[PDB]
Amino acid sequence: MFNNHEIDTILSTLRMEADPSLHPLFEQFEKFYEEKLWFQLSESLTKFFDDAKSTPLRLRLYDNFVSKFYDKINQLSVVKYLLASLKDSKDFDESLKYLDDLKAQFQELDSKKQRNNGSKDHGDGILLIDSEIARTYLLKNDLVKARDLLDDLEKTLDKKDSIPLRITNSFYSTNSQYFKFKNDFNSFYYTSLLYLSTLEPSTSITLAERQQLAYDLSISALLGDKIYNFGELLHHPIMETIVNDSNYDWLFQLLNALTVGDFDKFDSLIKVQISKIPILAQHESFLRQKICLMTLIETVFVKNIRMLSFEDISKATHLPKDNVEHLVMRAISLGLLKGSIDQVNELVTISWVQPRIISGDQITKMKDRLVEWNDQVEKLGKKMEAR
């Protein structure tokens, strides 16, 4: 409707008498495009509330403003939504014109400065080039050429700095599909962890991102192993605010399945769709054996007992003692326990380096044993005050 012309007129008139960037033929075209309230392009502060609609092919007219453009909003605001609205366009020719043809040293290093960035406020798109090359070629090339695109990127990340952490989101979004094309998801799980911490700032705080992120966190935590098993599911319950079923309900049963460890609960967990991956069969016994071990480690540690045996370990995992010795060693190399399991003695020696977070049940007795037992040293040291 007329919301494009009316709102832009107020902000422009209070600054410029006549629109410097808008050509007098293009001024009427602002409200002439669509029938909706918000169109596919805008300027200055009005552009902040504007985003892409369907296929913003009219951005060429917005790029046509160069000379007098900076008299309204700074000249570096062109590339803000230029490549943001084309994210759903998926075109190779339109990407090369805004990346390779953009090059560097255009007008910005002559009469102005350069803040790099470019997707917020006003910044130059040189830093935007190296960030968007990996996304455009993500669905084009394969795992071979995908490594060379990360070399010019990761090295650029350490070469220059940016205040917003959103630049890692595009870095983690590329590695998300890069690790998805592979087999082992261990690297895919650690990638989504730092991606969630960067969701708090701007650049799409909407809940549409949590829908696709919950699907990544469900598969990453299933076949990945870093900290506990399900312990990271209750830290950020962003999945409870989105669709419950369609692969999102597997984490509902997985929460109470690992605490129990019954085979009947696993039938509702894995289905025919997820059972076509051979990696699932390997980590099916890795999740249950670890969560049953985490309980035994908390159980074995009371006061003086650092040592387990082959009884409670094999009965909980329902596995023969011959394999269990070598199956824990796969989790031993992860930094859990440094102990050395014996054979003839049938006793598990445990050197426990594991942090084991989520405290507060122990701290009642744990913290008091660092005072009352330490007070025994203070009482016995009062007889040393002679000199």
């Binding site: 911490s197 830290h235 942090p355």
Partner: protein, 165 residues
């Protein structure tokens, strides 16, 4: 290894300014250190005083002169030109968070690694209340973000031929 060696004149020079303006009770006195160190080992001998004031209710209130305070360093440059700015020292009795936000402004004038000491107006502890800070980017396992934080290192009091006896 990085070991901060502090001259006792630093504590005595600031103690005079605590009595003059009656600066105490959650009032920080900012200062700058001096020395020549091209290695990881930091040698702190001479020190200056920065006329800093803050608010107790608002920890974001800070005012620090950039090139106006450096006139003391220019006057000292003609005295000793071998020593330059290797860092800075604050008070921070409750350890205000204002130093966590901006590590650039203090590093701009100090080419050495960022260093932040603690001189309390009290300093009455029998232990070692004087603490050193190194501001770098350290990975945190808390699950929030990895940002610039303080790195604690042990320090001591310097003894040379002048002040030993």
């Amino acid at each position: 290894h990085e070991k901060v060696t502090i001259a006792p004149l630093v504590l005595l020079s600031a103690l005079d300014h605590y009595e003059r303006t009656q600066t105490k009770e959650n009032k920080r006195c900012v200062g700058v250190i001096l020395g020549d160190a091209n290695s990881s080992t930091i040698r702190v001998t001479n020190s200056f005083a920065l006329p800093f004031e803050e608010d107790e209710k608002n920890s974001d209130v800070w005012f620090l002169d950039h090139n106006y305070i450096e006139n003391m360093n220019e006057m000292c440059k003609k005295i000793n030109a071998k020593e330059k700015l290797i860092g800075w020292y604050h008070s921070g009795p409750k350890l205000r968070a204002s130093d966590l936000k901006i590590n650039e402004l203090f590093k701009k004038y100090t080419q050495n690694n960022p260093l932040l000491l603690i001189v309390d107006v009290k300093q009455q502890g029998v232990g070692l209340p004087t603490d050193a800070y190194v501001a770098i980017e350290q990975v945190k396992d808390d699950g929030t973000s990895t940002e610039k934080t303080f790195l604690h290192l042990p320090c001591t009091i310097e003894a040379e031929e002048a002040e030993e006896i």
